[PDB]
């Protein structure tokens, strides 16, 4: 019985993101996650998902969801992914 | 909403058709994309 809309702003609508080596993590809990409003906050170049359906998402529950915010170069966008290698994947941010 | 509606809009009823605000200045993700679905039915049916 929770009706507080989740603050999906302050991450996508944020003015300036954090550095790569200092990626910020925001704890998100005690809310109703409406992922439909994310598609209209900003254009999307890639919306890859791992293990979870990109569309069948508004009908699930989560213990804790952490949004990692960082800006990388355009040629290294393929590096942020589970199991990938590179400078960012080794010294800046590595996904399990 | 639960209140009945009419030919005009209301606080609890709106038009189901929304317009696309397609603008060439939008980045990748909001630009218009044409989709052509070529449905095929390949089977033992008489092919034309």
């Amino acid at each position, epitope marked *: 019985n929770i009706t507080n809309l989740c603050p999906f702003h302050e991450v996508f609508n944020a003015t*300036t*993101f954090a550095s790569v080596y200092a990626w910020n993590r925001k704890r998100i809990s005690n809310c109703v996650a409406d992922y439909s409003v994310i598609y209209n906050f900003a254009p999307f170049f890639a919306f890859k998902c791992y293990g979870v359906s990109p569309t069948k998402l508004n009908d699930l529950c989560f213990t804790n969801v952490y*949004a990692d915010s960082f800006v990388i170069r355009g040629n290294e966008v393929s590096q942020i992914a589970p199991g990938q290698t590179g400078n960012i994947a080794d010294y800046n941010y590595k996904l399990p | 909403g639960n209140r009945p509606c009419n030919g005009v809009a209301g606080p609890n009823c709106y038009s189901p058709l929304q317009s696309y605000g397609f603008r060439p*200045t939008y980045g990748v993700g909001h630009q218009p994309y044409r989709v052509v679905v070529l449905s095929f039915e390949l089977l033992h049916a008489p092919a034309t």
Partner: antibody
């Protein structure tokens, strides 16, 4: 030196849809976000929106999504303002602002001299 | 959120005074999205304080500030005749710049 001189003051009747412009110089008017700020006489500043010179991407405040439209001309480095259905309460001072290399893209670094818009019958 | 400021403040020449600024939001990347502008009567506002830990070029060093939760303050040392003007604090964390209700700085003489 960099200059952001705007157009002269104007006085029109409600419903004439006047146009205000601003001429910038001293910098590359292709990559710096430029916008306008509205201020009524005796009150605080009210930001309306901004525009990018390279591509006409516009970001409007929720209180100015349809009350005013912003356009720019990269070929002459001139921004423009246009209104529709001017009301009696729409008269206010309008200040322009640019991004600048001081802070972020949204931080207003430099300001113009201001253009007074008078609306009365 | 909307920024709130004291409408009228008082001071004196050669003394120090502080201007409060409340209602500042916070986004991912820090809470330093606070800026100040000074607008003389009949003139355009001038950027005096942005990235409060820093100051722009040409701005006198007598202006300074600090952050404390959701409330910011602007400190001025050595009030002079040219300091008698309006001041507006601005927040730009949510990709939207908002301004307070304005402040009126008066000094005795």
């Amino acid at each position: 030196q960099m200059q952001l001189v705007q157009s002269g003051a104007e006085v029109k009747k409600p419903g004439e849809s006047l146009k205000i412009s601003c001429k910038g110089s001293g910098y590359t008017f292709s990559y710096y976000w430029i916008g306008w700020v509205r201020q009524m006489p005796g009150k605080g500043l009210e930001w309306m929106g901004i525009i990018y010179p390279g591509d006409s991407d516009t970001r409007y405040s929720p209180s100015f999504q349809g009350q005013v439209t912003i356009s720019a001309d990269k070929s002459i480095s001139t921004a423009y303002l246009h209104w529709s259905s001017l009301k009696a309460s729409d008269t206010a001072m309008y200040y322009c602002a640019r991004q600048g290399d001081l802070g972020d893209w949204i931080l207003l670094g430099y300001w113009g001299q201001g253009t007074l818009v008078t609306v009365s019958s | 959120s909307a920024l709130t400021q004291p409408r009228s403040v008082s001071g004196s020449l050669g003394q120090s005074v502080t201007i409060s600024c409340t209602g500042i939001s916070s986004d991912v990347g820090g809470d330093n999205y606070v800026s100040w502008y000074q607008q003389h009567p009949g003139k355009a506002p001038k950027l005096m304080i942005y990235d409060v830990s820093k100051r722009p070029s040409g701005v006198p060093d007598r202006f300074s500030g600090s952050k404390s939760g959701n409330t910011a303050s602007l400190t001025i040392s050595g009030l002079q005749a040219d300091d008698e003007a309006d001041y507006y604090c601005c927040s730009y964390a949510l990709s939207r710049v908002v301004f307070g209700g304005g402040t009126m700085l008066t000094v005795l003489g």
